C-alpha cells in the first residue's frame, strides 16, 4: 500500500466502470503536485475480481456492485469459498446498473424467463454480471444446463458474439448509456429486453440492494418503449489497509469537483452528493472518506 500511487480496478473497456475509474483518477491526478498521489486505472473482469484483488493487494480501490459490496465484506454467496473480507470499506456510490438483457431480433426472447433454452452469455467468472446472473438463476431454479450454451465472454466481446450469431442474448449489469449496448443496438439490430415477473419481484422484495429499474425509450436505437428490470448501484470500495490520507484525498477530489465529475460521463448526470454517501453502501465507510464527509457537512 503506497501513499503516493493507487490503482483502481474497473471492468471491460466498453462498459461504464472503466471510464469511471478514468474520471476519478483524472480528478486525483490534477493535484498530484500537492497530495503526491498518482492514480492509475486497470481494466478488469469486474466486481468479483475487484474485491478479490483488493484483498490480495494488487488493487487499492475497485468499482463494485452494491450486492457484491455486501457479499464481499461478509464472505457470502459468490464469496463463500473466499471467506469474509471484513477489511473492505465503502467510499461512495455512483450510477445505477440495471440487469440488462441484450437479445437478437430473431431470438424469441421477450422477457427474462425466455432465457432458458437459448444461447446466453451469462458472464465471465470475475464479473458482477455472472454473479448477479446466478441470483436470477436461483430465483428460476436454473443451472448452467438450463441454457443451450452458457457463454462466459467478457464485456467487450459480447456485442460481436451476438451480432455474429454465436449467442441469442447476453446479460450485462451496467449503467447507461454504454458502448457495448450501443454497438449491438446501433450496428447489429439488437433489442433491450425487460426482466419482469414473479421471480424478479421476489428478488427485489427480498434484498435491499435490488430495486426496480427503468431504461427510457430512446436510450438506444430500436428500443422504442421503456424497459423495466431490476438494478444495483455502482460503488467505489477500498480496504482499511489503504491510508486515511489517501482515501481522504480521493474522496475530496471527487466531491469538491462534483460539478466537473458529473460532466465526465453521461451516467453521472443525475448523481446527488447525499445519496453518494449512503445509497448502495451497506458496509463501513473508510475513515478517510468519513473525515472528508464530516468536513463537508455530509455526515454530522
Ligand atoms: N457491474 C459489472 C461491470 C459494469 C461496467 O463495466 O460498467 C461487473 O461488476 O462486472
Ligand atoms: Na456466484
Ligand atoms: Na429491494
Ligand atoms: Na450538474
Ligand atoms: Na437534473
Ligand atoms: Na446505506
Amino acid at each position: 500500500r503506497a501513499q503516493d500511487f493507487i490503482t483502481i480496478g474497473t471492468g471491460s473497456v466498453t462498459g461504464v466502470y472503466y471510464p469511471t475509474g478514468g474520471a476519478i483518477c483524472k480528478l486525483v491526478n490534477k493535484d498530484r503536485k500537492d497530495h503526491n498521489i498518482r492514480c492509475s486505472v486497470e481494466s478488469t473482469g469486474g466486481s468479483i475480481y475487484n474485491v478479490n484483488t483488493i484483498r490480495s493487494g494488487e488493487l487499492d480501490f475497485g468499482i463494485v456492485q452494491s450486492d457484491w459490496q455486501y457479499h464481499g465484506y461478509n464472505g457470502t454467496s459468490e464469496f463463500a469459498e473466499q471467506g469474509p473480507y471484513k477489511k473492505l470499506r465503502a467510499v461512495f456510490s455512483m450510477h445505477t446498473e440495471p440487469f440488462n438483457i441484450i437479445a437478437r431480433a430473431d431470438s424469441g426472447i421477450e422477457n427474462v424467463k425466455d432465457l432458458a433454452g437459448k444461447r446466453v452469455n451469462i458472464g465471465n467468472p470475475g464479473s458482477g454480471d455472472r454473479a448477479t446472473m446466478q441470483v436470477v438463476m436461483d430465483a428460476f431454479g436454473w443451472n448452467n444446463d438450463s441454457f443451450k450454451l452458457a457463454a462466459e465472454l467478457k464485456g467487450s466481446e459480447r456485442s460481436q458474439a451476438l451480432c455474429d450469431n454465436k449467442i441469442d442474448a447476453f446479460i450485462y449489469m451496467v449503467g447507461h448509456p454504454n458502448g457495448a449496448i450501443k454497438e449491438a443496438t446501433t450496428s447489429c439490430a439488437a433489442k433491450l429486453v425487460p426482466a419482469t415477473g414473479p421471480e424478479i419481484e421476489k428478488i427485489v422484495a427480498n434484498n435491499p440492494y435490488y430495486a426496480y429499474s427503468v431504461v427510457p425509450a430512446g436510450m438506444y436505437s430500436g428500443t422504442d418503449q421503456e424497459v423495466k428490470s431490476f438494478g444495483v448501484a455502482a460503488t467505489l470500495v477500498t480496504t482499511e489497509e489503504v491510508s486515511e490520507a489517501v482515501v481522504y484525498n480521493l474522496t475530496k477530489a471527487v466531491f469538491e469537483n462534483f460539478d466537473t465529475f458529473t460532466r465526465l460521463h453521461p451516467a453521472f448526470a443525475n448523481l446527488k452528493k447525499e445519496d453518494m454517501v449512503t445509497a448502495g453502501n451497506s458496509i463501513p465507510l473508510h475513515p478517510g472518506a468519513v473525515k472528508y464527509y464530516k468536513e463537508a457537512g455530509l455526515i454530522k
Side-chain angles (χ1 to χ4, degrees), residues 225-238:
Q225 276 87 18
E226 74 180 7
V227 177
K228 309 190 280 233
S229 185
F230 71 100
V232 300
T235 76
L236 188 71
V237 298
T238 184

Side-chain angles (χ1 to χ4, degrees), residues 66-80 82-125:
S66 52
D67 53 346
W68 306 120
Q69 179 191 119
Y70 176 82
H71 289 295
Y73 180 77
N74 282 296
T76 43
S77 180
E78 160 70 23
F79 295 99
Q82 289 58 49
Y85 186 47
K86 286 297 178 54
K87 296 178 175 190
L88 201 69
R89 295 286 180 276
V91 186
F92 47 81
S93 63
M94 276 174 300
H95 54 285
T96 299
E97 312 186 73
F99 172 71
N100 306 291
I101 300 165
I102 300 85
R104 286 179 60 90
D106 64 3
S107 69
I109 296 168
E110 325 206 320
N111 213 305
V112 59
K113 80 198 174 38
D114 297 333
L115 289 174
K118 299 287 173 180
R119 309 170 291 158
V120 181
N121 202 81
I122 56 168
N124 55 290

Side-chain angles (χ1 to χ4, degrees), residues 2-80 82-282:
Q3 269 293 89
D4 60 352
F5 180 78
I6 62 171
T7 308
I8 308 189
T10 60
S12 229
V13 295
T14 62
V16 179
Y17 284 13
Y18 182 68
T20 300
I24 297 172
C25 279
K26 269 198 286 195
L27 296 176
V28 172
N29 286 330
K30 76 183 190 49
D31 301 307
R32 71 185 173 281
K33 285 155 167 79
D34 294 338
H35 54 52
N36 309 305
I37 304 160
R38 159 68 66 178
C39 187
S40 74
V41 176
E42 295 275 355
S43 63
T44 69
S47 289
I48 306 306
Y49 177 92
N50 290 341
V51 169
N52 287 150
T53 306
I54 294 165
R55 175 175 187 169
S56 65
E58 289 86 20
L59 294 179
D60 306 283
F61 298 80
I63 305 180
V64 174
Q65 297 170 194
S66 52
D67 53 346
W68 306 120
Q69 179 191 119
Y70 176 82
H71 289 295
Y73 180 77
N74 282 296
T76 43
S77 180
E78 160 70 23
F79 295 99
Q82 289 58 49
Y85 186 47
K86 286 297 178 54
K87 296 178 175 190
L88 201 69
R89 295 286 180 276
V91 186
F92 47 81
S93 63
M94 276 174 300
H95 54 285
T96 299
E97 312 186 73
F99 172 71
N100 306 291
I101 300 165
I102 300 85
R104 286 179 60 90
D106 64 3
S107 69
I109 296 168
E110 325 206 320
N111 213 305
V112 59
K113 80 198 174 38
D114 297 333
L115 289 174
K118 299 287 173 180
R119 309 170 291 158
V120 181
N121 202 81
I122 56 168
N124 55 290
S127 65
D129 306 325
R130 193 193 199 271
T132 304
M133 197 34 189
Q134 181 60 51
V135 175
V136 172
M137 264 159 92
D138 284 352
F140 274 93
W142 291 343
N143 62 28
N144 277 15
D145 292 330
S146 302
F147 308 109
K148 294 192 176 197
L149 178 65
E152 298 181 295
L153 299 170
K154 76 200 203 174
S156 61
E157 304 188 347
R158 295 171 191 171
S159 173
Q160 196 73 60
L162 186 78
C163 295
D164 284 352
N165 202 14
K166 299 180 170 24
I167 44 168
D168 299 305
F170 62 90
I171 63 93
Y172 213 155
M173 267 333 279
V174 64
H176 300 284
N178 66 85
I181 302 181
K182 190 166 316 213
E183 185 69 15
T185 54
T186 219
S187 282
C188 325
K191 56 163 154 173
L192 199 55
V193 173
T196 65
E199 298 83 2
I200 299 305
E201 290 170 12
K202 175 178 72 176
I203 284 168
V204 169
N206 284 0
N207 299 281
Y209 34 70
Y210 299 134
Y212 292 128
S213 65
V214 185
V215 180
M219 200 31 90
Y220 301 107
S221 170
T223 62
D224 300 332
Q225 276 87 18
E226 74 180 7
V227 177
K228 309 190 280 233
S229 185
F230 71 100
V232 300
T235 76
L236 188 71
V237 298
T238 184
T239 174
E240 151 167 73
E241 291 183 351
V242 172
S243 84
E244 170 189 296
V246 164
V247 182
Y248 170 81
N249 278 303
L250 180 148
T251 305
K252 175 191 246 184
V254 170
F255 278 75
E256 289 297 309
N257 295 280
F258 184 74
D259 291 334
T260 303
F261 184 70
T262 61
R263 295 175 65 186
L264 293 183
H265 189 283
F268 308 154
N270 292 302
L271 300 179
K272 211 190 172 283
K273 288 189 187 180
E274 301 79 5
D275 295 349
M276 267 169 92
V277 174
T278 54
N281 295 324
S282 60

